Design a binder for this molecule. Structure first.
Ligand code: HEM
Ligand code: HEM
Ligand SMILES: Cc1cc(N)nc(COC[C@H]2C[C@H](OCc3cc(C)cc(N)n3)CN2)c1
Ligand SMILES: Cc1cc(N)nc(COC[C@H]2C[C@H](OCc3cc(C)cc(N)n3)CN2)c1
Ligand SMILES: C[C@H](O)[C@H](O)[C@H]1CNc2nc(N)[nH]c(=O)c2N1
Ligand SMILES: C[C@H](O)[C@H](O)[C@H]1CNc2nc(N)[nH]c(=O)c2N1
Ligand SMILES: [Gd]
Ligand SMILES: [Gd]
Ligand SMILES: [Zn+2]
Lengths: 402, 401
């Protein structure tokens, strides 16, 4: 009845029984698989709330207690009287951690139980959002000894617009579109760059200009806030044996902080809830720096390495990409900023899968996202079959607010 | 119709071909199982008609006299015999379509170029061996590899199937050691032991070519030795690392899959071995570096003087790249056809474009199409794909033992 899941390296087999509890539908059908696609009332709120409250009381081993029953009744009553309900602080903490644990595209989930949760549900203005965000960044960065964290802004509520952070991450480099169609800086950020400019930002003209934040309080247009440079820790990139590499003037920032996803807990929705961890080196060295549609540095690095770029069979692309990844790891370690390589990260994810099989009888995982973008089959996750499904609490994509 | 996006270029297509998917896959709206390796006259006539209609459409003769005549011919045969026979032209079309339809094959730009050998008259395992040797000779062509398939008689009621027991025509022996380890290729321990059970005298090397176990209908399989002159191999050397050659690594020229079933118009061919040429990552990354295959990555890293005591030195990645370099260099030096993963994936992108115009889409399995090293350095990583089953097709089937 349950999907049989094999590891091909070791030959071990498990059944994913957790998948039977999937709470929402994905995009696949028996006729065709769409797994590779990036982006494919009171009664329902009450059912989701009860399920969540049940999750919480199981988690602390107090299922069936007087406390468990009291909370179920209180939530049902609150929904009946007000159309919604409020989480207790302990439930919010549990819910944020479960959403991380449930995230099928995250390879760093061995860390799921260690998350600092900042409660910003009393926030009242964009100015105050900025205060909460600056404190999050300071805490999470911790002078380079990075700590995972999430700040939760007020939930969606009838009669009131949402809190939103327009930027996709708290730290993003500007992308300035040029006349020929080319881009100076990060091509991923052309749209948000133009929005900042539309909203009164005086642009720079470098390749690594840190963008301001556009923060939206309910029923207000977004407001522009500049991050203090002392707050945004960055790492200049150099290579331990290719001395010219430093002359490329590349850098990246310490803190990956996703700020445009929706956090869903017990039927409640938090459209502003930025979360941060630390980088896996391939995100920077392979994707951000080597994607043709990002900084696209591969050929210039290969030429400086004096590789033969005239034919593909010399594997110049592969050689240059490996050395760029070496530079990222070396540079972050030199700067004493937490980073994890893809071998260490995937090994820890295998341990997570093992832990979760025992704890819950399975683990939702998106193979295409878990396997790293270089050296895929050299990592244990390549050889591991995975089952992808949606559990709640969850982090979800949402439409851009403009 | 699914909207399909390329993230490198931002281009969008719609796969209208997927709406024609015959067979169901393993996914449901509740959970995706896309990463898993292995998830009556009336029915036969329905598949036969669909196939005949497909063929006549392909040659621009739908509704012609010839089309209606063929449909009547097939109906009469099934009514009389319970089955039917393909014309040779239909067999060729069907085999090419099965390749074209294979979602896991990155080499499909070549689909229209396939030599089809008709061995449907085959009677004995001895004759099966002769056909197989002729296939190997033609396909190998002194290193200038040519894609080919040999089709043995179709499955029929009250008669056993022809089967090739070996998973490929060329396989290296895997010998179980007393401590439980393997000498040679661990992928082939089972078939090696079966060969031994059937009277093969084993060697004790790391690259011993296995004999063939060939099964004629209702007979036990018979052992056949491939003449060594028929099996082209390439010793591996590296262009700049002079010690690499001393490792004594080698691989064979011809990837020839022999355990899959070919399905065409409801007819089933349980023995229909097919061959092309290698993409270098198959040998250099998977066959030589998989921990459950030859597992030589750390040996190479030792020889390269790499720091194997921290993962962050990326010693694994560096050793793997040089092994792939050695494969490409060695095959090119030996004048044996090979394609690197960059060239192959670029040609596949061209194939997707051709198929969008021709058929309105292309079934493709992303996890298999993206190469096992340097995935995102290839264009296919950034291409969304839709996976579904079309017929004619190559299918997995149970081992005959
Ligand atoms: C602690 C170290 C962490 C590491 C090493 C890590 C690693 C990763 C990586 C490599 C990705 C793929 C990102 C991409 O390719 O764009 C990812 C995605 C993701 N991570 Fe983690 N992560 C960490 C912490 C966290 C935390 C603290 C959370 C939430 C509380 C989280 C939730 C997610 C989610 C929801 C995604 C999917 C994002 C998307 O779909 O665009 N991660 N993570
Ligand atoms: C001509 C050059 C060819 C190249 C470069 C090529 C490339 C590949 C590669 C890299 C794979 C993945 C195999 C693996 O990872 O084990 C594959 C699979 C496959 N190929 Fe092709 N191929 C070629 C020719 C052919 C031909 C002639 C046929 C059939 C007529 C074919 C049918 C298939 C099928 C059915 C699979 C899936 C096998 C499976 O599921 O195990 N290929 N091909
Ligand atoms: C928490 C965390 C830790 C860590 N090591 N890495 C991350 C990176 O997450 C970045 C997430 C955000 C984008 O998703 C949204 C998005 C938007 C667009 C326009 C394209 C796209 N592919 N994806 C891509 N990956 C997040
Ligand atoms: C025709 C052809 C051309 C080319 N370049 N490469 C090939 C390689 O096909 C080899 C086939 C044998 C395995 O069959 C699937 C399989 C079988 C088994 C027992 C395990 C596994 N993980 N995967 C994987 N691909 C075939
Ligand atoms: C089309 C394909 O799904 C897309 O390129 C995915 C592939 N896997 C990925 N995996 C991760 N971790 N991050 C990504 O952005 C992507 N992109
Ligand atoms: C579990 C996973 O599906 C399995 O390891 C797949 C991944 N992708 C692959 N891709 C190819 N081309 N060949 C393979 O054998 C595999 N193995
Ligand atoms: Gd140097
Ligand atoms: Gd030495
Ligand atoms: Zn699927």
């Amino acid at each position: 009845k349950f999907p049989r899941v094999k590891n091909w390296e070791v030959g071990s087999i498990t059944y994913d029984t957790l998948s039977a509890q999937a709470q929402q539908d994905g995009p696949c059908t028996p006729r065709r698989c769409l797994g590779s696609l990036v982006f494919p009332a009171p009664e329902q709120l009450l059912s989701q709330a009860r399920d969540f409250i049940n999750q919480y009381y199981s988690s602390i081993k107090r299922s069936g207690s007087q406390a468990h029953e009291q909370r179920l009744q209180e939530v049902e009553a609150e929904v009946a009287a007000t159309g919604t309900y409020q989480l207790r602080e302990s439930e919010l903490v549990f819910g944020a951690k479960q959403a991380w644990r449930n995230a099928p595209r995250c390879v760093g989930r061995i860390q799921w139980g260690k998350l600092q949760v900042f409660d910003a549900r009393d926030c009242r203005s964009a100015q105050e959002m900025f205060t909460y965000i600056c404190n999050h960044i300071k805490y999470a960065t911790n002078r380079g000894n990075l700590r995972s964290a999430i700040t939760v802004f007020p939930q969606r509520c009838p009669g009131r617009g949402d809190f939103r952070i327009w930027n996709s991450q708290l730290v993003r480099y500007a992308g300035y579109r040029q006349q020929d169609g080319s881009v100076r800086g990060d091509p991923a950020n052309v749209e948000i760059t133009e929005l900042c400019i539309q909203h009164g930002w005086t642009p720079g003209n470098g390749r690594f200009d840190v963008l301001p934040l556009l923060l939206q309080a309910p029923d207000e247009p977004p407001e522009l806030f500049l991050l203090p440079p002392e707050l945004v820790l960055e790492v200049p990139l150099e290579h331990p044996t290719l001395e010219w590499f430093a002359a490329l003037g590349l850098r990246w920032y310490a803190l990956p902080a996703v700020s445009n996803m929706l956090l869903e807990i017990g039927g409640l929705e938090f459209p502003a809830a930025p979360f941060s961890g630390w980088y896996m080196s391939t995100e920077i060295g392979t994707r951000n720096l080597c994607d043709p549609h990002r900084y696209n540095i591969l050929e210039d690095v290969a030429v400086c390495m004096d590789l033969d770029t005239r034919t593909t069979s010399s594997l110049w692309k592969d050689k240059a990409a490996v050395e760029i990844n070496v530079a990222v790891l070396h540079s972050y370690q030199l700067a004493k900023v937490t980073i994890v390589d893809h071998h260490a990260a995937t090994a820890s994810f295998m341990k997570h899968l093992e832990n979760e099989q025992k704890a819950r009888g399975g683990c939702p995982a998106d193979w295409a996202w878990i396997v790293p973008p270089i050296s895929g089959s050299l990592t244990p996750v390549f050889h591991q079959e995975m089952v992808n499904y949606f559990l709640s609490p969850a982090f979800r994509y949402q439409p851009d607010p403009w």
